[PDB]
Design a protein around this ligand. Structure first.
Ligand SMILES: CCCCCCCCOCCOCCOCCOCCO
Ligand SMILES: CCCCCCCCOCCOCCOCCOCCO
Ligand SMILES: [Ca+2]
Length: 208
């Protein structure tokens, strides 16, 4: 007893703009200031480094313009955080240090809305295990509602990549490189999947 469950929404930066939804459980015990948060994040992300040279001095940013290709990227991030809340702060704001584990689903690539380049779509993917650290600030606003601030940093371990090309006839090709297969180093320099991620969000938590 008693056990305080809230749902928390936040918006802001996670390697790109996006948001998160989470459930928090706190006051898990009479004595304890332990807290647990499970959360999911969606954010935009950049998929290929514009400054990477494929030539020649010619960069992916350069050929992107030439062929009018559309780049897109995203991260979906499942996270678990253990939070601790210091007693006799003594501040008007609650600050909880937290550490946790993450699982990220990265994906992006480009489409060929035309002209040139047969015509099609190319997509790359990586699922990574991450670790991270941060602080969560909460301020009581109204009944059952607090303002929440969150700053943290996550690190992700390099994982395999999976490429899918699709032609106009609809034919599909698939492949994957691992650490450490042949062209992995190169793929990894070019593909903008997570490594270090700054997390900076504002949001609100509703109790019950
Ligand atoms: C302030 C901590 C940063 C310290 C690390 C040095 C430079 C960090 O860049 C490393 C590359 O990390 C790539 C993550 O990019 C942001 C996430 O969004 C794109 C990935 O999907
Ligand atoms: C939060 C503390 C964790 C300590 C991090 C130490 C890192 C040592 O192992 C690094 C292994 O990860 C390989 C890096 O992956 C390549 C990233 O480049 C991505 C761009 O495509
Ligand atoms: Ca880019």
């Amino acid at each position: 007893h008693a056990a305080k469950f809230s749902v928390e929404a936040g918006a802001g930066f996670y390697g790109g703009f996006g948001g998160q939804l989470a459930v928090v459980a706190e006051d898990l015990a009479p004595g304890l200031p332990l807290g647990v948060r499970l959360g999911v994040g969606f954010a935009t992300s950049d998929a290929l480094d514009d400054g990477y040279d494929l030539g020649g001095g010619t960069t992916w940013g350069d050929v992107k313009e030439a062929g009018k290709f559309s780049e897109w990227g995203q991260n979906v991030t499942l996270s678990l955080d253990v939070l601790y809340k210091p007693s006799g702060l003594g501040l008007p704001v609650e600050v909880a240090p937290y550490f946790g584990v993450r699982y990220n689903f990265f994906s992006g690539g480009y489409t060929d809305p035309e002209d040139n380049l047969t015509i099609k779509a190319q997509t790359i993917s990586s699922n990574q295990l991450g670790l991270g650290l941060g602080v969560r600030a909460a301020y009581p606003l109204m009944p059952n509602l607090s303002l929440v601030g969150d700053l943290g940093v996550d690190y992700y371990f390099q994982a395999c990549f999976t490429r899918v090309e699709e032609d106009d006839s609809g034919n599909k090709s698939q492949s994957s490189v691992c650490p450490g297969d042949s062209g992995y180093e190169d793929v990894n320099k070019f593909v903008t999947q997570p490594e270090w991620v700054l997390k900076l969000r504002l949001g609100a938590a509703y109790r019950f």
